[PDB]
């Protein structure tokens, strides 16, 4: 790939990003201030495990939708065999929308954007389930705290999707191309802000896989 197919490979795969982002960087900001009362707080914790497995279920399938347009409009996605483009969804979407959510989470207080305010981790008790919650704010701390940007998830989460090592691709060595291609990508880009160093601070390659499986 030369350095002008390379700059733009980082520039239509930010724009299939900027399309697909479901929420506006600059709301999700704006509202940190906006923190769910104790009152709230309680509200929450006393619905019951259902009703929360409901909301939160609903609130994924919508993401997951974006995230499927996100894989859409990638050319280079496009390209692929249909059983390919259902493996990379099937075993990716979960793990796009875990990137995506760094961008709405407050490393200064570990507080989440949740139904319209910020909360902590105590919003999600009914489920059951604080050591899956306690994971997925530690992950997002790991990126929030890195003040991880809107083209660094876009390039970030376009290599978690194109990735040559999951199981049941027909065409891995096509994967693999483009998953290579969209690393030279997401490294030229990396330098071009100066934020090269971030790669040595990013998690480890499986986290996300180890942490959605
Ligand atoms: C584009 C953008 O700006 N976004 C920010 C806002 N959005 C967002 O945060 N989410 C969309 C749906 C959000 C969501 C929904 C469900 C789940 C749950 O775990 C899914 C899961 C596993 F089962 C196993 C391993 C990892 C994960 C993950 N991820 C599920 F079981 F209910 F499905 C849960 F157990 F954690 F609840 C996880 C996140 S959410 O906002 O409701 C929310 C819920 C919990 C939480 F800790 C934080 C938020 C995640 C969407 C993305």
Redesign the pocket.
């Known amino acids: 790939a030369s350095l002008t197919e390379i700059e733009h490979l980082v520039q239509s795969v930010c724009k299939s990003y900027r399309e697909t982002?479901?929420?506006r960087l600059e709301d999700?900001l704006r509202q940190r201030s906006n923190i769910f009362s104790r009152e709230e707080v309680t509200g929450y914790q006393r619905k019951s495990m259902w009703e929360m497995?409901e909301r939160?279920?609903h609130?994924?399938t919508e993401?997951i939708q974006y995230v499927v347009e996100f894989a859409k409009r990638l050319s280079g996605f496009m390209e692929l065999c249909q059983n390919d483009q259902i493996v990379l969804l099937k075993a990716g979407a979960?793990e796009v929308?875990?990137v995506?959510?760094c961008?709405?989470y407050n490393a200064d207080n570990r507080t989440?954007?949740?139904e319209g305010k910020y909360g902590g981790m105590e919003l999600?008790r009914a489920?059951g389930?604080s050591e899956?919650?306690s994971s997925?704010?530690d992950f997002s701390h790991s990126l929030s705290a890195l003040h991880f940007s809107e083209d660094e998830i876009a390039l970030y989460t376009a290599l978690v999707l194109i990735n040559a090592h999951r199981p049941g691709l027909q065409e891995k060595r096509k994967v693999e191309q483009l998953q290579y291609n969209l690393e030279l990508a997401f490294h030229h880009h990396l330098c071009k802000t100066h934020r090269q160093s971030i790669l040595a601070k990013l998690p480890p390659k499986g986290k996300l896989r180890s942490?959605?499986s």
């Open positions: 982002c479901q929420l999700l497995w939160c279920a609130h994924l993401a979960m929308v875990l995506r959510m961008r709405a989440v954007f949740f999600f489920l389930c899956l919650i997925i704010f942490l959605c």
